[PDB]
Design an enzyme around this catalytic site. Sequence first.
Site, PDB file in Angstrom:
ATOM      1  N   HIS A 175      -7.842  -0.380   3.204  1.00 19.27           N
ATOM      2  CA  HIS A 175      -8.393  -1.335   4.199  1.00 19.27           C
ATOM      3  C   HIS A 175      -9.818  -1.795   3.979  1.00 19.27           C
ATOM      4  O   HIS A 175     -10.514  -1.894   4.896  1.00 19.27           O
ATOM      5  CB  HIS A 175      -8.424  -0.710   5.866  1.00 19.27           C
ATOM      6  CG  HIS A 175      -6.875  -0.164   5.956  1.00 19.27           C
ATOM      7  ND1 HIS A 175      -6.083  -0.670   6.750  1.00 19.27           N
ATOM      8  CD2 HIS A 175      -6.353   0.818   5.416  1.00 19.27           C
ATOM      9  CE1 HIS A 175      -5.132  -0.179   6.986  1.00 19.27           C
ATOM     10  NE2 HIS A 175      -4.914   1.115   6.223  1.00 19.27           N
ATOM     11  N   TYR A 226     -10.625  11.261   7.224  1.00 18.19           N
ATOM     12  CA  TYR A 226     -11.369  10.279   7.454  1.00 18.19           C
ATOM     13  C   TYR A 226     -12.796  10.719   7.775  1.00 18.19           C
ATOM     14  O   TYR A 226     -13.573  10.063   6.772  1.00 18.19           O
ATOM     15  CB  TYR A 226     -10.792   9.667   8.666  1.00 18.19           C
ATOM     16  CG  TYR A 226      -9.806   8.813   8.731  1.00 18.19           C
ATOM     17  CD1 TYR A 226      -8.599   9.262   8.527  1.00 18.19           C
ATOM     18  CD2 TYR A 226     -10.021   7.308   8.995  1.00 18.19           C
ATOM     19  CE1 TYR A 226      -7.247   8.654   8.268  1.00 18.19           C
ATOM     20  CE2 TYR A 226      -8.852   6.315   8.866  1.00 18.19           C
ATOM     21  CZ  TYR A 226      -7.443   7.160   8.510  1.00 18.19           C
ATOM     22  OH  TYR A 226      -6.478   6.362   8.463  1.00 18.19           O
ATOM     23  N   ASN A 231      -1.705   0.525  12.988  1.00 21.94           N
ATOM     24  CA  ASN A 231      -1.379  -0.704  11.953  1.00 21.94           C
ATOM     25  C   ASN A 231      -0.736  -1.566  12.685  1.00 21.94           C
ATOM     26  O   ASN A 231      -0.204  -1.227  14.089  1.00 21.94           O
ATOM     27  CB  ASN A 231      -0.540  -0.140  10.966  1.00 21.94           C
ATOM     28  CG  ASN A 231      -1.194   0.712   9.736  1.00 21.94           C
ATOM     29  OD1 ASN A 231      -2.647   0.500   9.593  1.00 21.94           O
ATOM     30  ND2 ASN A 231      -0.480   1.355   8.716  1.00 21.94           N
TER      31      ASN A 231
HETATM   32  C1  HEM Z   1       0.269   6.188  10.125  1.00 17.80           C
HETATM   33  C2  HEM Z   1      -0.507   5.997   8.846  1.00 17.80           C
HETATM   34  C3  HEM Z   1      -1.954   5.529   8.735  1.00 17.80           C
HETATM   35  C4  HEM Z   1      -2.356   4.588   9.496  1.00 17.80           C
HETATM   36  C5  HEM Z   1      -1.580   3.611  10.351  1.00 17.80           C
HETATM   37  C6  HEM Z   1      -3.502   4.240   8.851  1.00 17.80           C
HETATM   38  C7  HEM Z   1      -4.475   3.357   9.381  1.00 17.80           C
HETATM   39  C8  HEM Z   1      -5.956   3.228   8.795  1.00 17.80           C
HETATM   40  C9  HEM Z   1      -6.380   2.295   9.099  1.00 17.80           C
HETATM   41  C10 HEM Z   1      -6.484   1.257   9.932  1.00 17.80           C
HETATM   42  C11 HEM Z   1      -7.754   2.380   8.327  1.00 17.80           C
HETATM   43  C12 HEM Z   1      -8.824   1.313   8.388  1.00 17.80           C
HETATM   44  C13 HEM Z   1      -9.978   1.645   9.218  1.00 17.80           C
HETATM   45  C14 HEM Z   1     -11.214   0.865   9.409  1.00 17.80           C
HETATM   46  O1  HEM Z   1     -11.172  -0.328   9.740  1.00 17.80           O
HETATM   47  O2  HEM Z   1     -12.210   1.256   9.041  1.00 17.80           O
HETATM   48  C15 HEM Z   1      -7.462   3.567   7.533  1.00 17.80           C
HETATM   49  C16 HEM Z   1      -8.443   4.006   6.743  1.00 17.80           C
HETATM   50  C17 HEM Z   1      -8.183   5.051   5.978  1.00 17.80           C
HETATM   51  N1  HEM Z   1      -7.210   5.989   5.913  1.00 17.80           N
HETATM   52 FE1  HEM Z   1      -5.579   5.929   6.847  1.00 17.80          FE
HETATM   53  N2  HEM Z   1      -3.768   5.423   8.042  1.00 17.80           N
HETATM   54  C18 HEM Z   1      -2.752   6.090   7.864  1.00 17.80           C
HETATM   55  C19 HEM Z   1      -2.462   7.077   7.051  1.00 17.80           C
HETATM   56  C20 HEM Z   1      -3.410   7.669   6.052  1.00 17.80           C
HETATM   57  C21 HEM Z   1      -3.312   8.617   5.395  1.00 17.80           C
HETATM   58  C22 HEM Z   1      -1.999   9.573   5.157  1.00 17.80           C
HETATM   59  C23 HEM Z   1      -4.387   8.876   4.587  1.00 17.80           C
HETATM   60  C24 HEM Z   1      -4.734  10.083   4.020  1.00 17.80           C
HETATM   61  C25 HEM Z   1      -4.856  11.133   4.226  1.00 17.80           C
HETATM   62  C26 HEM Z   1      -5.350   8.016   5.155  1.00 17.80           C
HETATM   63  C27 HEM Z   1      -6.534   7.799   4.654  1.00 17.80           C
HETATM   64  C28 HEM Z   1      -7.354   6.835   5.221  1.00 17.80           C
HETATM   65  C29 HEM Z   1      -8.588   6.570   4.517  1.00 17.80           C
HETATM   66  C30 HEM Z   1      -9.431   7.613   3.599  1.00 17.80           C
HETATM   67  C31 HEM Z   1      -9.252   5.586   5.016  1.00 17.80           C
HETATM   68  C32 HEM Z   1     -10.670   5.157   4.808  1.00 17.80           C
HETATM   69  C33 HEM Z   1     -11.521   5.438   6.025  1.00 17.80           C
HETATM   70  C34 HEM Z   1     -12.733   4.927   5.768  1.00 17.80           C
HETATM   71  O3  HEM Z   1     -13.465   4.860   4.752  1.00 17.80           O
HETATM   72  O4  HEM Z   1     -13.530   4.856   6.672  1.00 17.80           O
HETATM   73  N3  HEM Z   1      -4.717   7.270   6.133  1.00 17.80           N
HETATM   74  N4  HEM Z   1      -6.256   4.310   7.858  1.00 17.80           N
END
Ligand code: HEM
Lengths: 84, 304, 721, 719, 83
Positions: D97, D384, D170
């Site tokens: 993202h 996160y 999402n």
């Molecule tokens: C239901 C499944 C998931 C949804 C709906 C989801 C949703 C999101 C969203 C919307 C963001 C962007 C947030 C922003 O605008 O800053 C994000 C970032 C991220 N997510 Fe997910 N995610 C999911 C699963 C995962 C999984 C399994 C991981 C890993 C364990 C993951 C790791 C991350 C990471 C590392 C970021 C970047 C966070 C940051 O840099 O601020 N997510 N996720």
Amino acid sequence: FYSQPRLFWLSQTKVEQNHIVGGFSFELGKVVRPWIRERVVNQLTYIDHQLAQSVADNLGIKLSQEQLKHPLPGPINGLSKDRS
Amino acid sequence: NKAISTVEPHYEDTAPAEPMMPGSDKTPKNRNEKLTQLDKFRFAPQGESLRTNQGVKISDNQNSLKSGARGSTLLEDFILREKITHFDHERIPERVVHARGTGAHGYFQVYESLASYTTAEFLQDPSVKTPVFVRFSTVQGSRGSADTVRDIRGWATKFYTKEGTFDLVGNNTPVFFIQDAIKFPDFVHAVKPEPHNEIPQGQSAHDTFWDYISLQPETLHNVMWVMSDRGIPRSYRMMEGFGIHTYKMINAEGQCHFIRFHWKPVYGVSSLIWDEAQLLTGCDPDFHRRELWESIEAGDYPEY
Amino acid sequence: NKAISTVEPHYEDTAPAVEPMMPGSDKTPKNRNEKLTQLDKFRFAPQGESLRTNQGVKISDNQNSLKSGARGSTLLEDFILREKITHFDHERIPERVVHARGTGAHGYFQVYESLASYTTAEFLQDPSVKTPVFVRFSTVQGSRGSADTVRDIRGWATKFYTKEGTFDLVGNNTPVFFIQDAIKFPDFVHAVKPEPHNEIPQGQSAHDTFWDYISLQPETLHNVMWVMSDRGIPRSYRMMEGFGIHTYKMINAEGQCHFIRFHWKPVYGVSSLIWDEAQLLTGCDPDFHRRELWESIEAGDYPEYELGLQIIPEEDEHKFDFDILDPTKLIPESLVPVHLVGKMVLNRNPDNYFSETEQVAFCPGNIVPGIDFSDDPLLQGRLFSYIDTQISRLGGVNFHEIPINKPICPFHNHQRDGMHRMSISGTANYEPNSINNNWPREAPPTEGGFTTYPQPVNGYKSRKRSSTFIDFYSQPRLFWLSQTKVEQNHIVGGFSFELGKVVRPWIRERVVNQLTYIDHQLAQSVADNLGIKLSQEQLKHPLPGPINGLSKDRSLSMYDGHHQILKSRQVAILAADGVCGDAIDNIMKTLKKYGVHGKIFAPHVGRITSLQGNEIEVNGTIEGNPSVMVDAVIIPDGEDSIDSLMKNGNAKHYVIQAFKHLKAIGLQGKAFKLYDALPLPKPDEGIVVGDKAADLAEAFCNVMRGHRIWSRESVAQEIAG
Amino acid sequence: NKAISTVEPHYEDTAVEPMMPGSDKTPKNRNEKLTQLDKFRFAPQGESLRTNQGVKISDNQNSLKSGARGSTLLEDFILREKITHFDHERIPERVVHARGTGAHGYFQVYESLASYTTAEFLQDPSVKTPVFVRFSTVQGSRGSADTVRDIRGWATKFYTKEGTFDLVGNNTPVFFIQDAIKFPDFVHAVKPEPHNEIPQGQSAHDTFWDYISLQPETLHNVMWVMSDRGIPRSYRMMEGFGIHTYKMINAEGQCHFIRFHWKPVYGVSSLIWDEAQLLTGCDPDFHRRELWESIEAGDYPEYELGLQIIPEEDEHKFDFDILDPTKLIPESLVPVHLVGKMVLNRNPDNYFSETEQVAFCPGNIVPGIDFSDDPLLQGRLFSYIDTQISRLGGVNFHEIPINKPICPFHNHQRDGMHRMSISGTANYEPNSINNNWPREAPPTEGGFTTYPQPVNGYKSRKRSSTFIDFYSQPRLFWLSQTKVEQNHIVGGFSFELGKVVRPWIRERVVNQLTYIDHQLAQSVADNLGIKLSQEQLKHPLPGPINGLSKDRSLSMYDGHHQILKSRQVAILAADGVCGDAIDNIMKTLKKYGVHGKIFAPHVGRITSLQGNEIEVNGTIEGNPSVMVDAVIIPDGEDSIDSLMKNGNAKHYVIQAFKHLKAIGLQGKAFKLYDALPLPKPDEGIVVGDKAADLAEAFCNVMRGHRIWSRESVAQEIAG
Amino acid sequence: TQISRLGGVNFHEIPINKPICPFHNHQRDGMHRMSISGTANYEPNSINNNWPREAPPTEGGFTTYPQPVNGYKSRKRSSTFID
Ligand code: HEM
Ligand code: HEM
Ligand code: HEM
């Protein structure tokens, strides 16, 4: 919290016990707030009564008879001291 | 004259036609597989030109580039700026605990297969020479603090095995101060230099530490250890080691034993006395580090 | 169950229903300035507040991880645990690459009268203004946990928060530096630092690579002389001198340029330890200088210093027997006097050492309008270094937004982004722009915009040391001839002790050889202590001539050219149970009448009881507070007290050690029996005996005015202790 | 002389509407968080240009040199400070993202939810809880295009009085994987391939479909992203889902299982693939701009927070695991209760300081909400905070203004890079030197506690048997789509697989499709030139889910509303256009809240046949038909003649036709359509002579969003 | 710029950035130091006979061509640029 400290205390030679008394007294003698020193000495009365008394002497702390009658822990699986 | 020459590029010899030295200089015969892997990252500067990090030969390492010999330093001196930039960024954060430490290379052999208790490769064959790296350390002080303070000593062994790197990260006493990891920042903060003034260095002899101890009696056992002479060891070669935690060993049958790790020193268990340890922090803050390094250079190899 | 209650959430009071050191907001809130007020917004008052996560969620149980049961496995879903451990895990930032060990304080500066004839610098224009300062004192070589009273140069960084911008004066406590060109700095530092294979030794130049570099770079000899002198072991950051070292420019409103050099002159005098005292003190209080500064502010013994300027008109630049652009050269105060133009007071300790002292960033490049740089080739290289090093130390290019580093005047520009960006800009980020009418706007010179003085520049692009710099020996000689005989002996002691730890003999020989070009007696005396036989030719080596008529300069000697101040000194009162309470009370009152702090040291802490049945609080144990920690020693009377102390080896050693360290010793009444039993000689001018405590304390104080009993030095060598 | 002044210091003044910082354009829209942000704001009006240390700068045009033609000097600290800051402007982009947009707003609960949760921000309808929202794509890097085919991220930060709560969801109700350990595998597959870093912002490459083909658990979310859900018209016009089952705990200690929903007030609408791809070309900032401009227009994004509420005792009564993130809970079985409303009403002032630096994490819950054992969610909790350590430079990212709570946050944490706070009290608990302040808070005073769920099992790495159902929900989603929506699904698979080089990956994905629906597979297979075996054609199909085979809510156009308000209409006009037509069209558009944009062969003003001047919104060439929802062409002899000479303006009509959009033609404007190689007018070609009448009829046609019936003939159109 | 983009001052040790010639000098440490040095880290030194050593210009040691420099310290755009 106290059975194993007592076990350690009673496994020490007399010399080693004296150096443990020195450690607490030297360290606690650099503690400014007196209630902290008195509370640490209070914890020592649950471990061994002579240890508390020797350390409280070095800190100018008068132990109470209540403190000097504080219950001590029993042996650990029948063990009162361990050579190691 | 030859005073003028000291501030001009040095093209002539400076050596006239035993001090501590790097291990490759003093003990090149003491080899293991790990050290051999490291050989390709070593340097042989004999006969080599001084160069920039890009490989460019330096003609004058004594003077910045200027507008005349009494002039203003020019931004186009990429050599100066490269040399100064690297220097400016030499430091990395020190470890948040056990910042003060010293390390050495060696090897481990199991006495006889422990197959009855564990499948771990490095405990199966006495013929294997498992490379180790060990870091001994104090706990509270920052990385310039003295060796012979009253403190717990850290003892971390890295076993480079054919099935993975196994780290045994223990101390020199068999217990620790607290029971649950959520308390560790509180405990460390209490023993560290106090937050307003960052006093005292390398000592638990201050209010906040004993404030914590008094309010957290679970700490009393290891406090007893460090107030003893265990808290002022004579040498890293002359203390015991402990993993402290119960682990598990799983044999090839799937049978689990509970295990605790010990290091028993071949050179015995001996300590300073407090007044001598305090005086040593004054006249050799590097005493344990020096002693370990010299004992290896003398052939009095630490054995545990 | 009270043992159980300790490992359960703590919802009740923990406090009980000598004062310890404390944050400056707690101890001295009345000491204020505009910078401290700006920092107030970052302060917190936790009284009555819940413990919370960083997101603001209240925590119910700060004692336990979240587990699968009371005796189970820790769950990954415990976000409270991981947030707490994460923050802890990343507490540390890189230490400074040099001057890692340091201590800071807040204060203010005031100009005595407008300097407008010499400079347009705003902070030197108006005596009515109180300019906030933050100051960091430091050693050089040691890492951030190394000891205070090592032999080293001391660093002295003053940040002036002026209305026309932040001015950094980044100096040392000696008037010269070791090298002439910045390109050598990493070489010199690498040589002085612990050696790269084993990282030994800490806080000491007493090792091979340092002296190896010295013997091959004779430009270093002048500043080496200073640090081998007692200048290298100061009694207090309050009792040392300060120097910007480099020549700077000052520009006035008419565009005329004066060459200058900055000085700090201590109001509390210039005082040093002696080497054996300084070493022992690293052992029993590695925080001595830092603690002393902190407590002196809490006791109201505020560090005070006078800013001084040596002022040389532009036309007199080439009128000296040295280059004033040479940072290994000082300008003799007998040639060019120091004009005392202002005073700085440090009057408030920080609340949080890391937020304030660890994170502060000074750089010589941070000048203000009215001041300019010279062509000093060390200074020029320094300007690049400070901003560059801070990029990794403080985490990026926004370290100026860290509260302690923030200016107190405005600072709008078109810069943007970077790690940890705190400001929120909403206007055009490029100049010139028309979409925001080109705001912020350039400021004309007449409105205070910074402009470089149009110095001529003539030459050929080259890497070459200026011939005006090839003079490595005249000023080390000037320094040596300026020293008293005691001071010369300590110089010889410094060289001898340090060289004696040098393993390779030829390094020792080459350094002594350098000494033969500074002075023959110095070289010979060092050679003797090192078992080196000097050649006839070496004793024939040509010595440098005088400097603009000067063979010596009284100002260069610390004990012959500077005052010793009694106020703020420390005195150990050795007492046990049975002490005469009237004597203690009278001694303590007399000492405080002169600003001297008396501290009772007894065989135990808490209270001792007088021979009159009164209880006297003790400051610490004799064991815990050895003589190297105090300036002088007094022992009051009391039959039971003197007998107790005569059975105490620490007590007896106190007086032996104080004697050997050339300190004042006062003995009341039966206390002289204690001195008689020791293998010390007949009482000298620094031993005072009487029976009336007030009269004894007065004479004692008078002896303490001399700082140390130098005449005793010879007989103290022989004393066993 | 004046040429000389441009390279000398600029001491003098240098000075329909453009996009501006939120403070300039909407200062009256406020909330508690925006008020807290005001301390960090800067006003340079009347201020001198200065260094970071506050030194005024006299000459921002020249380096300090040895002479006007000389060498630059190392002593120029102004230059070096300025360049140094510039050199270090960039911080790492988010690992996923990376491409996103932010806006401020507020949230209001309709009525207290005390029956189900103690969460403070769901207690009091009079409270306006501030929010910050970041919308994003998933695959692409920072500079990639908005209207790609992708899942869209939807992160809402609620700044509550009891703590900062982050709802990180999402725009689809399921995810691609079941266990967090597979996340780096899935992302690596979808991300650009590691040798060549190709392709940007597309799942249409070998490694993605390789992973799909070996991991059938992914098919459900794949079905969503191949549908038109993968190309939303606008962030204002998509749904939102937290995906995971969370817990809600009330004051009695009762636990309800919960799933979060965002339902858009402006309806659910999507692009079509051809249009979307064109739009990444002509406006790669389309969704960001549209959201920024909708806030400035007053068409504020609005969404209703909904909850599906399941009592704890009902956890095992479904044909799927509610802890499985590849499963959705059909709204026919468990309905969504709309409990609150969120309004986005203020753009940031500085994109980097606010949108780039914002940090969201699912682990940032508050009391009243708790986690479930969903193994995807449990892994997200670690990730996160850990990722922010490098992205935002350390462990103090919560002190960055956008990330600060608006409640207090006292603890014993200290130091770390760029520490802003200055603490002066005891840094350990328990202490007595400060009487143990700050203090732990009892659960009845709001201290967070974990609900004491039972834990029984063995330590093991194993996928729960109740998770092993890969095709039933994909089949349900397929069967719930209309036939146009089914074809776009087929077109999605076929276009994407068409770019896979290795044919066996293509055949393997089609084989997976045969376990979902046979005609889906057959249609994709035909498109890819794949002959399906007869064994494949009769692969067994999953049964109904709790007696359910379709769910209307899973279809966008059949299950959700289309809203006329806030849509955009291109008005093609040149000099000579009838001015009264334009006035009547604009007045009608405005009556329904539609935005009319005048696109003309040149910018500035066009002259009408009445001689009045009309301000132009942009050129035809610069604003292609893919940027508007519909096209109207007013009358006027000279205008129409000019447009018929213009290839772009003729193409504008052909392209809008192919993209199934409404086209209105007034009077002689019909000539233009007739001259084009287009079939005769259909329901979406509105022809009239009266401008007002024509506009009203045109608006009614717009309500249907697209002329789906035109799609077959649209594939034969040369445009 | 490369100090923050590449994680510190040893970015020249990242394989793609390494030179193919020798590159001995007295620089040390920094984040992610790959090479292991065992000789004197200052110049001049005698303990390793001042190796690595400066290189004379006629042996290929870099030198700046001595172009004349004549002017006044100033921030000014050259008149010859104003076209
Ligand atoms: C239901 C499944 C998931 C949804 C709906 C989801 C949703 C999101 C969203 C919307 C963001 C962007 C947030 C922003 O605008 O800053 C994000 C970032 C991220 N997510 Fe997910 N995610 C999911 C699963 C995962 C999984 C399994 C991981 C890993 C364990 C993951 C790791 C991350 C990471 C590392 C970021 C970047 C966070 C940051 O840099 O601020 N997510 N996720
Ligand atoms: C069982 C008691 C513990 C022992 C015996 C122990 C031992 C050690 C040792 C020996 C080191 C230094 C390793 C080295 O040389 O680099 C160390 C470092 C460290 N320990 Fe512990 N530790 C214990 C408990 C904890 C706890 C509870 C925490 C916090 C969760 C913790 C966190 C750390 C950290 C963060 C480091 C620094 C690691 C690094 O930077 O490389 N330890 N521990
Ligand atoms: C005139 C001789 C010099 C003096 C008096 C001097 C003084 C100081 C002082 C007092 C500090 C510590 C400031 C503080 O944080 O409290 C310092 C730091 C430093 N100096 Fe020097 N220095 C000199 C020469 C040099 C040279 C030649 C260089 C290299 C170009 C250099 C580079 C540094 C660096 C990198 C730091 C660390 C700065 C930081 O981490 O913030 N200095 N100097």
